[PDB]
Amino acid sequence: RTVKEITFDLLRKLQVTTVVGNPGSTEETFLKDFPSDFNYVLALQEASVVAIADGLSQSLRKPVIVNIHTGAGLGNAMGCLLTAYQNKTPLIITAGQQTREMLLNEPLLTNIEAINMPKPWVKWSYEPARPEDVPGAFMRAYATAMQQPQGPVFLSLPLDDWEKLIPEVDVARTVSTRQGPDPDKVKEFAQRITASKNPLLIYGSDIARSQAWSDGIAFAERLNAPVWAAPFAERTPFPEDHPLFQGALTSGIGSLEKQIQGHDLIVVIGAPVFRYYPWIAGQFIPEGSTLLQVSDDPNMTSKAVVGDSLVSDSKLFLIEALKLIDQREKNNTPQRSPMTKEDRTAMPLRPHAVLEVLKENSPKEIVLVEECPSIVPLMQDVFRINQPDTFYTFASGGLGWDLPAAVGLALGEEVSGRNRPVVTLMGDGSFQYSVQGIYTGVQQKTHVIYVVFQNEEYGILKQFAELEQTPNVPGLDLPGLDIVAQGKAYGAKSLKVETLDELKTAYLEALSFKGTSVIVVPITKELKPL
Amino acid sequence: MRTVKEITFDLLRKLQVTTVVGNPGSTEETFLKDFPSDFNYVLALQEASVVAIADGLSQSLRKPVIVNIHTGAGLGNAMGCLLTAYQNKTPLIITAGQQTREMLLNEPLLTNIEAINMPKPWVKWSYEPARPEDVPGAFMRAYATAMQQPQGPVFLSLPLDDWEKLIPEVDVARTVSTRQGPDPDKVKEFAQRITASKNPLLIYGSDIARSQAWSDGIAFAERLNAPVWAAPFAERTPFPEDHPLFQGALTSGIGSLEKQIQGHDLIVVIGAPVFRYYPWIAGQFIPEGSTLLQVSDDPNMTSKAVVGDSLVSDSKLFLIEALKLIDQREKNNTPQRSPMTKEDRTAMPLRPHAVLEVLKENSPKEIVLVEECPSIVPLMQDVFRINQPDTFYTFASGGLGWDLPAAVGLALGEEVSGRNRPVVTLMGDGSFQYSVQGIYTGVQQKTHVIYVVFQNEEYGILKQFAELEQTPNVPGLDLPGLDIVAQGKAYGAKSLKVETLDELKTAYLEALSFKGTSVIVVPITKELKPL
Amino acid sequence: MRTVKEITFDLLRKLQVTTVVGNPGSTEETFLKDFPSDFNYVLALQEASVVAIADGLSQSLRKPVIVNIHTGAGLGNAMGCLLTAYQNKTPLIITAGQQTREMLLNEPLLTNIEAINMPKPWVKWSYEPARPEDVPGAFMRAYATAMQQPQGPVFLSLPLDDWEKLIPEVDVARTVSTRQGPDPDKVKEFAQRITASKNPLLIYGSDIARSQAWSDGIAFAERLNAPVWAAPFAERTPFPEDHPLFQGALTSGIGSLEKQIQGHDLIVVIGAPVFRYYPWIAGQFIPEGSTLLQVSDDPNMTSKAVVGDSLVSDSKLFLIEALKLIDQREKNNTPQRSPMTKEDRTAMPLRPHAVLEVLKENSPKEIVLVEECPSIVPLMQDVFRINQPDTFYTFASGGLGWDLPAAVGLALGEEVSGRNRPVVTLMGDGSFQYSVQGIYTGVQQKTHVIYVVFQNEEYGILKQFAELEQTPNVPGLDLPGLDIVAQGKAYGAKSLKVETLDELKTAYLEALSFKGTSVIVVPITKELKPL
Numbered sequence A: 001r002t003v004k005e006i007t008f009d010l011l012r013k014l015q016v017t018t019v020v021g022n023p024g025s026t027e028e029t030f031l032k033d034f035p036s037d038f039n040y041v042l043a044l045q046e047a048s049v050v051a052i053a054d055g056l057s058q059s060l061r062k063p064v065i066v067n068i069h070t071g072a073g074l075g076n077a078m079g080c081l082l083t084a085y086q087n088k089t090p091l092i093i094t095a096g097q098q099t100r101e102m103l104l105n106e107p108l109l110t111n112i113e114a115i116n117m118p119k120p121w122v123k124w125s126y127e128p129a130r131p132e133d134v135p136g137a138f139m140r141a142y143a144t145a146m147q148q149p150q151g152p153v154f155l156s157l158p159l160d161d162w163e164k165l166i167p168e169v170d171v172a173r174t175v176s177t178r179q180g181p182d183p184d185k186v187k188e189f190a191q192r193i194t195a196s197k198n199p200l201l202i203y204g205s206d207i208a209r210s211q212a213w214s215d216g217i218a219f220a221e222r223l224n225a226p227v228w229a230a231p232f233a234e235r236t237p238f239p240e241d242h243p244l245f246q247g248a249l250t251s252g253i254g255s256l257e258k259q260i261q262g263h264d265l266i267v268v269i270g271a272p273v274f275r276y277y278p279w280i281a282g283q284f285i286p287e288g289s290t291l292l293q294v295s296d297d298p299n300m301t302s303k304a305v306v307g308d309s310l311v312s313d314s315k316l317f318l319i320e321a322l323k324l325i326d327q328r329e330k331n332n333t334p335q336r337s338p339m340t341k342e343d344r345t346a347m348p349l350r351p352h353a354v355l356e357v358l359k360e361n362s363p364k365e366i367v368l369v370e371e372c373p374s375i376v377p378l379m380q381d382v383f384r385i386n387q388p389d390t391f392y393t394f395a396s397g398g399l400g401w402d403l404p405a406a407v408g409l410a411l412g413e414e415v416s417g418r419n420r421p422v423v424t425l426m427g428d429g430s431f432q433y434s435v436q437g438i439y440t441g442v443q444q445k446t447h448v449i450y451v452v453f454q455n456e457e458y459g460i461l462k463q464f465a466e467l468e469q470t471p472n473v474p475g476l477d478l479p480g481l482d483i484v485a486q487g488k489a490y491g492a493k494s495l496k497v498e499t500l501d502e503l504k505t506a507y508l509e510a511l512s513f514k515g516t517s518v519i520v521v522p523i524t525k526e527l528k529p530l
Numbered sequence B, C: 001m002r003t004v005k006e007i008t009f010d011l012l013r014k015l016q017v018t019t020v021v022g023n024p025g026s027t028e029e030t031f032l033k034d035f036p037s038d039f040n041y042v043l044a045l046q047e048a049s050v051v052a053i054a055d056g057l058s059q060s061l062r063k064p065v066i067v068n069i070h071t072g073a074g075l076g077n078a079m080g081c082l083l084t085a086y087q088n089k090t091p092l093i094i095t096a097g098q099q100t101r102e103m104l105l106n107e108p109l110l111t112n113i114e115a116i117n118m119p120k121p122w123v124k125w126s127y128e129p130a131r132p133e134d135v136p137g138a139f140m141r142a143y144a145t146a147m148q149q150p151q152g153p154v155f156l157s158l159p160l161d162d163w164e165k166l167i168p169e170v171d172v173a174r175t176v177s178t179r180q181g182p183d184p185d186k187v188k189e190f191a192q193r194i195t196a197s198k199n200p201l202l203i204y205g206s207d208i209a210r211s212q213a214w215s216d217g218i219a220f221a222e223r224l225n226a227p228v229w230a231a232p233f234a235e236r237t238p239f240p241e242d243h244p245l246f247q248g249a250l251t252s253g254i255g256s257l258e259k260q261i262q263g264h265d266l267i268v269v270i271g272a273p274v275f276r277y278y279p280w281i282a283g284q285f286i287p288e289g290s291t292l293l294q295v296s297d298d299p300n301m302t303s304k305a306v307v308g309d310s311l312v313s314d315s316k317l318f319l320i321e322a323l324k325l326i327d328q329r330e331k332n333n334t335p336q337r338s339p340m341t342k343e344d345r346t347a348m349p350l351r352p353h354a355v356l357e358v359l360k361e362n363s364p365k366e367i368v369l370v371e372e373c374p375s376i377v378p379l380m381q382d383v384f385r386i387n388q389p390d391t392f393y394t395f396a397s398g399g400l401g402w403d404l405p406a407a408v409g410l411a412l413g414e415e416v417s418g419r420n421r422p423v424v425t426l427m428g429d430g431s432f433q434y435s436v437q438g439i440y441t442g443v444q445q446k447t448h449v450i451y452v453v454f455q456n457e458e459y460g461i462l463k464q465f466a467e468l469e470q471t472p473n474v475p476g477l478d479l480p481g482l483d484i485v486a487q488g489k490a491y492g493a494k495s496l497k498v499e500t501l502d503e504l505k506t507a508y509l510e511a512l513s514f515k516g517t518s519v520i521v522v523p524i525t526k527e528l529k530p531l
């Protein structure tokens, strides 16, 4: 049979039957007579292609294939590829390559030294040494991506390989997708925890990926210790209305340290130590304290700022550790403050008020995605996430990921059949990076609701300039954008609301409309402290 | 505040990494200034030997050893042995001096240009610290990266001017795990497959040696009463070779290995690649109708296996968990391997099997055995049936020039542990040349290492390959005119050539009684057995 | 159709690249099968020597030489000498066998994993052909890439199964330029600066040697009547060293070089980096008030210069064009360098300047001189004043282990050209060890090479550095217990130790009369002059 026929059969066996792509000449032999039992999802630009695939893969917990056009396409996708790598998403990135007949002399659209282009943001990058190896290379790509710590891989595929007649090969294999902790280390860590007087827990997003939500609750309740979310936790690791939950840690060395004072043992599960952002002088952890870290990614433990670490799937660790820790009595761990109420009469509208209007009109069953940097602490006050697989944002800080990722997550809602609407809180600046993603939402009829907070500026960059005392930075203002027209351009239901009652009406309408909507909300240019 | 150097050496003390194997240069002198008396510096004359000595020592001690070499020039000379350290999974911390930051931008003589890219793809991590302040922390990250499973070498490029800088005293010391266990769901799945199988066959690889799973591998095999084979090119003995269940070492062609494992429905590979093939011999990966399970501690190995269902795990952790889920089987007439054959000792020129027999029958119970004499491997496997852990060592990579210096490192390890076994090293005459300078370190350190050189005046195994693969008239396969006795003398070793098996016995016993480095040259037949 | 092998060898004939220096392995046997009689295969015992021999030969012939080594293991052993070939700008075609495409995907033993990345950053191009059909074309692209200015090595990874494939007969042979000239606008600008200067000073580097610009450099200097200095660490003589205008070799510190060139308003550097510094010596790049012009054939060199206005050009092409635009100047009392000093020959232990004088006064008019004895360089520069092109050679990189085997390659070149000059090689005892195996190739090929080993039982220049840079108590600087005579004997060379200057004279004259490889060991004082 042909390389193509055999390869698609392998993909059926692996149950990887979705291809998100933006086509080109070098991909046509792969896509020829695309089979009806596979799904091809078009996006208009490659950053959106990857991010859509990422959102879908996160939802389904299995690989999705990306198919993009040689070097030019891979290049457009590199920002979102970095983000997929940091999200630990097992994407199989494929790009067509010029025909082996001409490759040596590098004609137009040759992906020159292809394997080196996506470095350092893939687990493996490869261009098969012959057509006969293509199916085997897909199996190796799957195997590589799916073993812990999961992540994206890249295959460069010469266009002439697909039509080659080869004898059937049986390359299908299976692999493990988790590894457990060294039992000596679990005992060591448990001894430390048992001996501590006032432990504090910091949970990160490995807990979300590994489906350890309930195990994380059991562990925290066993200790009756305060729980914080690690700084810049991309996915909710702990129920945010639980009495033990304190909030999300700030992201400066000194600021985080101040937040965790008063505890002798700092126990970090499923997170880097630590995902800092601004520079704030200080000590990593309080004087007199010590720290333990669990991550499923040897890279994270290898570069931690402090502590004793072990490498483990978060769920397997939490299960093992639970067996060794005895129940502790209530210890008046504080309860976080109730949500505040913003002035809804202020004009221009204040973002906390906007968030409150969305929240009070939301069904329990939504997916919430966020890429609106300046309002994050306000969102954290208002949307207290209390279910798993509900909140998603990037692990990387790379703008242009969330808009298309929301479409991918919505596609996942249809595959699972759960069909929650995906409510996506977007900054006006962030909205621009991968604005083309809206088209895929409309064409695929995904239920996605974009709420755009229009302050006509890159707000968080002004918050930074304030904190770090860097005045007169250019390019921070965004006058003259018509975001409603942006929604209209790609066929979304799109409107601007000028009052909170209009917002409630537009939002309820969007919740009732099985399709993609854009709701633009003008807000104050004023900014809270970073 | 203290100097970068003082803080770094204090970290190394805390980490218990206090041996540096090196070949010095100008860019390393600021690192080596006032080298402290509680550390050991081991000089070797060329950088391939530097890395291999460190590799051998690190394998012996099961902790990192520091390599200190001279910028890009030194790193370059070391790259073959670094590839081998990577495939051995040895947690070496490779350091090379770099030109001073005062000049780096304009790349004066002996700048290691794009230093982080030079050792790729053969390190787990490569780095040049962004400031002197980061040097101690970079050593900690280097240690952490190297010591987490799957273990392996890392590289730091260190500008010479950093060492004398006064920097804030920051505590960078951390600890890490060095093992990861299996997914319990996968252990259950694998145990179910094993329990249901009619006639399972076990293939053990060297993860078992590194992870100290020797006894657990025996327990597992005895629980199943299944035949055990060593994986092809297993660098370190994974199973006692005189155990009734042990069948031998698998050959390294696809079709040849397949034929050896026929008659078994389930193939269970623990601690090995699937598979470390070498010659091209067409066939099927496993017998028609069979299926395969694989356990490796290295996700790279499982990701590229030719066949099977795999999981990633430390070998010891897997064997312990799996034992819990499998029931004892009755003896099932698993065959016993043939006794060692007896070569014709009357034949001249001397035959290597007889040479090996003479060494074996005169060896003490406790030796370390190292081998890099490719054409005699099957003969060695017949004669030296290794029945203790941490006894046999060779390269994982096939890169000649590793074993001669690695033997010195293993010997240094015997002195550190205090066990003090002699290291007997079986060397081909061609192989001996690649890193011949390593002998000097053996002599200078007074390591008890005995090199037995099998002199057939040829690259024998390449002629074996030329036959199997039908490539006549290949040049450069003959090695006339080498005086290997003189090579030993050149570096100060006890050195002599023996012409009879009685002379060999006398020389070998003498070398065993001499606490130092010896070379015994044995002329053998140029005739070669089949691959 | 014909086999990939037949077509490739036919291309190599057309390109006139018919020498292969190699160390064979299984993955190269299909390439070397039925090696043709009109090509020459030169065996060396270790891959650092393989590359350096090829480098020396390629420098002699001014065309590529093929290196054939064994997958990642062989390439690894060669990386230090490959770095050096790159900095020498030698157009070597480095080839390594790769595992068969039948198994490559699953990476069996001796796979060169990510082969194209291993030799980075030390090749102009690295490639593994996408199919057997592309192999001949890949050799053509390899040749083209290597031979275009700035010349340098390239790497091909060649799967063993490609060679026997029948492929369409396609004509892939092409030709390329090997030189590029200067922007005429920049020549005019530079000429104007030179003409306007009051007291210009010339610094010449080794591009002049490679580009055969010897006479053009003399014409240019005589036109200006300006003092000429050799750039620091000039690997090959750029100007006749007994010419009245020649001042000497510049020192290699920023502040020391600056002091040497004081008193001149315009510094004109032709065919050199600006500058190849080594020790850190603080100061200004050029004297206050002066300005600098630079010509190099390598855009990398001009891109990273510490100072000046530069242009990229072949040295010969620039010198020819510039000569046209500059007027003759009158003699301006440019000083004449001091005559060679005369060392005390009565002193014992023997002093290296006296040893050098004895070699010089007994040397024939036509020799090739190679040097890798770091501590004696200034003494050599005083004694051996090179006054002919293509006579003196050393490394551009400072990587020890290059010169010993490179001497063999230079000797092979003397036989190819037919000129047959003896190659006299001045070696330190430490330096001698790195690639000692190279001697074997000299002996086996019967090259006329005379190694004079300066034995001070130490890494002398590292002690000089420890003094200048105040790093006491550095370990590994002493080299007791080496029998270098035995090293020569080991590889079949004429070998002896001399204890007096009269014995040295006798041994040296004998080696000059013996068409083969000799080693002469000369014990010298351990005392060391200042850097």
Ligand SMILES: Cc1ncc(C[n+]2csc(CCOP(=O)(O)OP(=O)(O)O)c2C)c(N)n1
Binding pocket: A079, A371, A372, A373, A374, A375, A397, A398, A399, A400, A426, A427, A428, A429, A430, A431, A433, A453, A455, A457, A458, A459, A460, A461
């Ligand atoms: C691809 C990419 N480009 C630039 C940035 C830098 N960046 C971080 S926040 C930010 C401004 C976001 O502005 P907006 O989306 O309008 O949200 P706001 O802060 O105003 O609420 C920018 C440009 C980035 N993180 N990623």
Ligand SMILES: Cc1ncc(C[n+]2csc(CCOP(=O)(O)OP(=O)(O)O)c2C)c(N)n1
Binding pocket: B080, B372, B373, B374, B375, B376, B398, B399, B400, B401, B427, B428, B429, B430, B431, B432, B434, B454, B456, B458, B459, B460, B461, B462, C023, C024, C025, C026, C070, C073, C074, C077
């Ligand atoms: C660094 C390196 N260069 C070349 C090879 C290829 N090679 C494999 S076996 C071999 C010959 C070994 O000869 P010898 O040590 O004399 O052993 P014999 O086969 O004669 O017993 C060679 C050159 C290699 N494996 N590694």
Ligand SMILES: Cc1ncc(C[n+]2csc(CCOP(=O)(O)OP(=O)(O)O)c2C)c(N)n1
Binding pocket: B023, B024, B025, B026, B070, B073, B074, B077, C080, C372, C373, C374, C375, C376, C398, C399, C400, C401, C427, C428, C429, C430, C431, C432, C434, C454, C456, C458, C459, C460, C461, C462
């Ligand atoms: C491959 C390599 N390793 C180490 C060095 C560092 N190095 C420079 S000079 C030198 C000593 C040379 O000693 P020797 O050849 O005996 O000459 P001497 O200085 O005693 O005259 C060393 C080890 C180097 N330049 N290249």
Ligand SMILES: [Mg+2]
Binding pocket: A427, A428, A429, A453, A454, A455, A456, A457, A458, A459
């Ligand atoms: Mg904004």
Ligand SMILES: [Mg+2]
Binding pocket: B428, B429, B430, B454, B455, B456, B457, B458, B459, B460
């Ligand atoms: Mg041999």
Ligand SMILES: [Mg+2]
Binding pocket: C428, C429, C430, C454, C455, C456, C457, C458, C459, C460
């Ligand atoms: Mg010396």
